[PDB]
């Protein structure tokens, strides 16, 4: 379904994981509602303090 792979990408981002990723996409995906504002906070809370 759509938040399986939603969550599996989320996590595909969050970690390195390039293979997993371009999978992930060339199954294909909506692009159009996977780009939500809270979606790219939670992604950005993902930065190295250090």
Request: charge should be neutral; hydrophobic fraction near 45%.
């Amino acid at each position: 379904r759509s938040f399986h792979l939603e969550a599996s990408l989320m996590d595909a981002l969050l970690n390195d994981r390039p293979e997993f990723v371009r999978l992930l996409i060339s199954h294909g995906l909506s692009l159009g509602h996977f780009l939500t504002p809270m979606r790219l906070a939670q992604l950005y809370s993902a930065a190295p303090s250090n």
